[PDB]
Structure formats: C-alpha cells, structure tokens
Amino acid sequence: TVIKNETGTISISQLNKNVWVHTELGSFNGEAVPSNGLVLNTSKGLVLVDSSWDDKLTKELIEMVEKKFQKRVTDVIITHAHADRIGGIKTLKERGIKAHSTALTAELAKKNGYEEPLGDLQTVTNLKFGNMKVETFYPGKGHTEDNIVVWLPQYNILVGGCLVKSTSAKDLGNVADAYVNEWSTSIENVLKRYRNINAVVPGHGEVGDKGLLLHTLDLLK
Ligand SMILES: [K+]
Ligand SMILES: [Zn+2]
Ligand SMILES: [Zn+2]
C-alpha cells in the first residue's frame, strides 16, 4: 500500500495497520536523494519519526497525513541533526508540534543554526502515544555523534535511521560527521538490545530486516 503526493516529491508506504514509512525526494544538483521516516497512527494523534529535507516538504508531508488519517500531527522524534531529519523543524515549532530529541542533537542543531528541538530524550526513553508505545535508544556514535534509533516494542519494528544502511548502499556515504571506529560498536549495541527484529527502516533506501545491521557492519570493514 503506497501513496504519492501530487508530484513524485513524497510517498507513504504502509508497513502495518497503524505504521507507515514516509519518503521524500530532496533535490541535489543533478537531482533526487530520497529520505525515510515513520508515521505512527495513534489514538491521540499522528506521531512522526523524523521530518524532511526542508520546510516545504515538511509542510506537505504533515498536510498529506493529517488529511489521510483525519487527526493532527502532535509529535515528532528527530533522530539526528542533519537536514534530512531536522530540515523542517521551523515548520514543526511554528505549528505547535512537539519536536523530541536528545540534548546532544539539540545542541548540534543550534550549532548548525537550526531551531532547537526539546532535548528531552535520554539514552533510553519510553514514550506512549494513545496505545502506541515507542522507545528511543542512543546506541553510541556512528553515522553521526548523536544518532538515535527508534523501537516499536508492539511490532518489533526498528527505525534504524541513517545509522543503518540499506542493501542498495554500497558504501557508508557522507562520513564527515561520522565515527567509523565506534559505528560497529553502536550497531552491536542495537543488535544486543533488540534481539528479535521484525523490520528495520534505514534512513535512506528500502525497508529490510536485521540483515541491514549486518550489511552496515560489513560496510565498516
Ligand atoms: K501492549
Ligand atoms: Zn545524517
Ligand atoms: Zn540521512
């Protein structure tokens, strides 16, 4: 089950009853770089994992899901301070959408001249929205200093974010902000904490499984 905006620009694919992936194309010189997050359909509103590349996409994304599920976006979890995750933080703040992050992610956002998310997430934080349970986990440095994962214990679904490379990624990508000697250890910390995983969402590329974590480990060798 897959739904595109008017344009190609934005797509949502259904994973299960109350969980979808959101994907948006960012436009870079000779063109399209897609980015993924999650949409959680809860009894108390829509909760997103991550925003998008910029404000224009972020608005359009909110407006699509609010229309479709007939409820407001109330909360977003920002999983690190690069533009594909936090690009639409301005839109979030101005609409009264709570933007959750670790304090490190918030510090880095401010350092890079983005508006500040909440800095409310700890190394392990458990949230509940309606009946929907969500855990955030800081496994250590990898793709960036601050990168976190998100876990839906009710579905054993892991949002890997940009810590986790898709099967189509044949290299680590941009590592300016990365910690390639700790990234393996951070991935291992994810595998140790979540020992039975039903689906893994990478920050870019196709949805997979535990094999994506092993793919990323191979990529680090
Ligand atoms: K339950
Ligand atoms: Zn990133
Ligand atoms: Zn990314």
Curated annotation (Swiss-Prot):
<feature type="binding site">
    <location>
        <position position="204"/>
    </location>
    <ligand>
        <name>Zn(2+) 2</name>
    </ligand>
</feature>
<feature type="binding site">
    <location>
        <position position="80"/>
    </location>
    <ligand>
        <name>Zn(2+) 1</name>
    </ligand>
</feature>
<dbReference type="InterPro" id="IPR050855">
    <property type="entry name" value="NDM-1-like"/>
</dbReference>
<keyword id="KW-0046">Antibiotic resistance</keyword>
<feature type="binding site">
    <location>
        <position position="82"/>
    </location>
    <ligand>
        <name>Zn(2+) 1</name>
    </ligand>
</feature>
<feature type="binding site">
    <location>
        <position position="143"/>
    </location>
    <ligand>
        <name>Zn(2+) 1</name>
    </ligand>
</feature>
<keyword id="KW-0479">Metal-binding</keyword>
<keyword id="KW-0732">Signal</keyword>
<dbReference type="GO" id="GO:0008800">
    <property type="term" value="F:beta-lactamase activity"/>
</dbReference>
<dbReference type="GO" id="GO:0017001">
    <property type="term" value="P:antibiotic catabolic process"/>
</dbReference>
<keyword id="KW-0862">Zinc</keyword>
<dbReference type="InterPro" id="IPR001279">
    <property type="entry name" value="Metallo-B-lactamas"/>
</dbReference>
<feature type="binding site">
    <location>
        <position position="84"/>
    </location>
    <ligand>
        <name>Zn(2+) 2</name>
    </ligand>
</feature>
<dbReference type="GO" id="GO:0042597">
    <property type="term" value="C:periplasmic space"/>
</dbReference>
<comment type="similarity">
    <text>Belongs to the metallo-beta-lactamase superfamily. Class-B beta-lactamase family.</text>
</comment>
<feature type="binding site">
    <location>
        <position position="162"/>
    </location>
    <ligand>
        <name>Zn(2+) 2</name>
    </ligand>
</feature>
<dbReference type="InterPro" id="IPR036866">
    <property type="entry name" value="RibonucZ/Hydroxyglut_hydro"/>
</dbReference>
<keyword id="KW-0378">Hydrolase</keyword>
<dbReference type="GO" id="GO:0008270">
    <property type="term" value="F:zinc ion binding"/>
</dbReference>
<dbReference type="Pfam" id="PF00753">
    <property type="entry name" value="Lactamase_B"/>
</dbReference>
<dbReference type="InterPro" id="IPR047917">
    <property type="entry name" value="BcII-like_MBL-B1"/>
</dbReference>
<keyword id="KW-0574">Periplasm</keyword>
<comment type="function">
    <text>Confers resistance to the different beta-lactams antibiotics (penicillin, cephalosporin and carbapenem) via the hydrolysis of the beta-lactam ring. Active on cephalosporin and penicillin.</text>
</comment>
<feature type="binding site">
    <location>
        <position position="174"/>
    </location>
    <ligand>
        <name>substrate</name>
    </ligand>
</feature>
<feature type="binding site">
    <location>
        <position position="165"/>
    </location>
    <ligand>
        <name>substrate</name>
    </ligand>
</feature>
<dbReference type="GO" id="GO:0046677">
    <property type="term" value="P:response to antibiotic"/>
</dbReference>
<dbReference type="InterPro" id="IPR001018">
    <property type="entry name" value="Beta-lactamase_class-B_CS"/>
</dbReference>
<protein>
    <recommendedName>
        <fullName>Metallo-beta-lactamase type 2</fullName>
        <ecNumber>3.5.2.6</ecNumber>
    </recommendedName>
</protein>
<comment type="subunit">
    <text>Monomer.</text>
</comment>
